[PDB]
Design a protein around this ligand. Structure first.
Ligand SMILES: NC(=O)c1cccc2[nH]c(C(=O)N3CCNCC3)nc12
Length: 351
């Protein structure tokens, strides 16, 4: 092929995010039987069906037996086949089982999106598949320059917002990308001047990123158990990098991961200290803020292109009986997000 004029870091990202082996590795992390549910047989409507049964299991857990649960648990396993041999699989009987399986389903939705891009489209060997797969993302991706001012600001956000309680690892920023999803800026125009616009982190495993870049960040579908997510079905962001970095699910067997910096239009925040599973905000509120014990120093806020960047080192927030060690941010309409950056990070595990 003609060999691709994309910059090296961008070609590496495309390799990373369309890796079919990482998709399969992720599936077997979730205990899915690839003999019975291979990558190419994944489909939205099976994932959707599974979501509803999970919501049934949610229903039975909300209202309390271990015999009247069994059937609901088993129906779940009927829809997404797991790998337990001649088995009896573990019973899905508690709220943690519901969270776990809804996190998995999230991730299969995204893997299905990624694979259907690979398997939709045309086949032309004289083009570089790197270039081809780049187009499938409908996203402009540029390398940000190590000496630029935006790079300085970003690396400082990373440097100052790593929580002491996440010191099992640290982070090097390998590459910084400026990104522009096709049509997102149009989607965002209603919110482009809203008060309380913040630049914030969103972490995800790297197998989600083709989906994230083609579709944007999304809300979990109506079928999904709202109980599966602490503040219900929104898009979750953090102001401490390590908090969002933990959701990369990197480790000593895959130390490289990807994290986002989106501009998020929070406006009038509904502030909450504990788990609250809602599907609409109260009238007048635009977002939820889960109140952390620690917060970036509000005195060190700093503007990058007229959007506040909360990059001060963590101080006490003043909040007393909160469930959350760190702030957390949720919006319930996808048009309130404009993705701006993507970092590739190297995690040094000190263990
Ligand atoms: N994705 C994040 O970086 C993130 C940041 C702050 C709070 C969060 N809470 C969650 C969260 O629990 N999720 C659960 C299932 N997948 C969507 C994300 N993710 C985050």
């Amino acid at each position: 092929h003609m060999k691709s004029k994309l910059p090296k870091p961008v070609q590496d990202l495309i390799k990373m995010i369309f890796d079919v082996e990482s998709m399969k590795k992720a599936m077997v992390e979730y205990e899915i039987d690839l003999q019975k549910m291979p990558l190419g047989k994944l489909s939205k409507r099976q994932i959707q069906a599974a979501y509803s049964i999970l919501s049934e299991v949610q229903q039975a857990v909300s209202q309390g037996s271990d015999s009247q649960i069994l059937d609901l648990s088993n129906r779940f396993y009927t829809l997404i086949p797991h790998d337990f041999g001649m088995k009896k699989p573990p019973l899905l009987n508690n709220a943690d089982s519901v969270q776990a399986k809804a996190e998995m389903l999230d991730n299969l939705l995204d893997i299905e999106v990624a694979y259907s891009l690979l398997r939709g489209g045309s086949d032309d060997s004289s083009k570089d598949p790197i270039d081809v797969n780049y187009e499938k993302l409908k996203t402009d991706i540029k390398v940000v320059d190590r000496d630029s001012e935006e790079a300085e600001i970003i690396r400082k956000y990373v440097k100052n917002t790593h929580a002491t309680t996440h010191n099992a690892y640290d982070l090097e920023v390998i590459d910084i990308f400026k990104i522009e999803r096709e049509g997102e800026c149009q989607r965002y125009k209603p919110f482009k001047q809203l008060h309380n616009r913040r630049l914030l982190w969103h972490g995800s495993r790297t197998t989600n990123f083709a989906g994230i870049l083609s579709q944007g960040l999304r809300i979990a579908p109506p079928e999904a158990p709202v109980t599966g997510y602490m503040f219900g079905k929104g898009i979750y962001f953090a102001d401490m990098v390590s908090k969002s970095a933990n959701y990369c699910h990197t480790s000593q067997g895959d130390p490289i991961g990807l994290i986002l910096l989106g501009e998020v239009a929070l406006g009038n925040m509904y502030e909450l200290k504990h788990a609250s599973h809602i599907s609409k905000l109260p009238k007048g509120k635009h977002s939820v803020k889960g109140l952390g014990k620690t917060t970036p120093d509000p005195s060190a806020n700093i503007s990058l292109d007229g959007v506040d960047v909360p990059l001060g080192t963590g101080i006490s927030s003043g909040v007393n009986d909160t469930s959350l060690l760190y702030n957390e941010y949720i919006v319930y309409d996808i048009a309130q997000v404009n993705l701006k950056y993507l970092l590739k990070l190297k995690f040094n595990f000190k263990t």
